[PDB]
Design a protein around this ligand. Structure first.
Ligand SMILES: [Mg+2]
Ligand SMILES: [Mg+2]
Lengths: 152, 152
């Protein structure tokens, strides 16, 4: 199939004016998991990231006249690669918009963005991912919170 | 035991002049794993990180007149926390200097550094970690390389 027939044009860069829609989408994403998302905290986070491109990038996933999803890339240095690595830090497609290939398109867009930026690797914390070239790393992830998460 | 009797003063911030020692230590770290580390790539990586504090921080672990280890903190945005999270990105103590509590001191220093910076969480990819408050996150990590790692 040809480019215009596919879903790549449906994934677009997000701007400051998109914050209200991004907040709604993140709120839906959180509600689906049974969490309440404070609107101030969400606004703060999206504005912080949009205000400093060095931190990463956000794309919205469009269908008709609506954004029906979004994906967030965050960036950090990696000694293993001697350069930046990226994370698919958050990724949401509305339930009604799933199973249409939008998620796959979003991941391809982020991967292309990474290559364009000279990003050396792309990771995600967790089907759609496997087909996008994400495979299990085999590394045990440890952590500790130093502050409450955003939904608190 | 009192502060001066402990190992916290043994963990110090690294500067540009430390690059030759950092490269040797990273080379030892890599050789222990059976890898050869290109010296140009190592120099490039340490200089990049030391040149841009927004990317993270490096500490050296001192014993007598020698650095016997180092630890690297890298920083990235996290939507989950609505702020920066940190990674213990690399961590090496020379074999002869292990089992003396130096690793524990290094991790405490990084954790304090994170709190001072308003970093919201601290993660590590993988005993010493457990006692430093790192516990299994339960999240499967997926990834794909977009470029060769530093030892290639
Ligand atoms: Mg999340
Ligand atoms: Mg490493």
């Amino acid at each position: 199939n040809l480019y215009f027939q596919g879903l790549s044009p449906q994934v677009r860069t997000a701007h400051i004016g998109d914050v209200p829609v991004l907040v709604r989408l993140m709120s839906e994403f959180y509600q689906e998991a049974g969490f309440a998302l404070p609107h101030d905290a969400a606004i703060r986070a999206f504005k912080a990231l949009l205000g400093k491109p060095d931190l990463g990038r956000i794309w919205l996933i469009a269908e008709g006249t609506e954004s029906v999803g979004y994906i967030v890339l965050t960036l950090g240095f990696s000694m293993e690669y001697g350069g930046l690595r990226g994370f698919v830090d958050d990724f949401f497609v509305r339930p009604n918009a799933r199973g249409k290939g939008l998620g796959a398109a979003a991941l391809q867009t982020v991967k292309q963005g990474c290559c364009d930026l000279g990003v050396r690797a792309l990771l995600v914390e967790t089907g759609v991912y496997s087909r996008a070239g994400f495979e299990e790393s085999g590394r045990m992830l440890l952590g500790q919170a130093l502050a409450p998460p955003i939904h608190e």
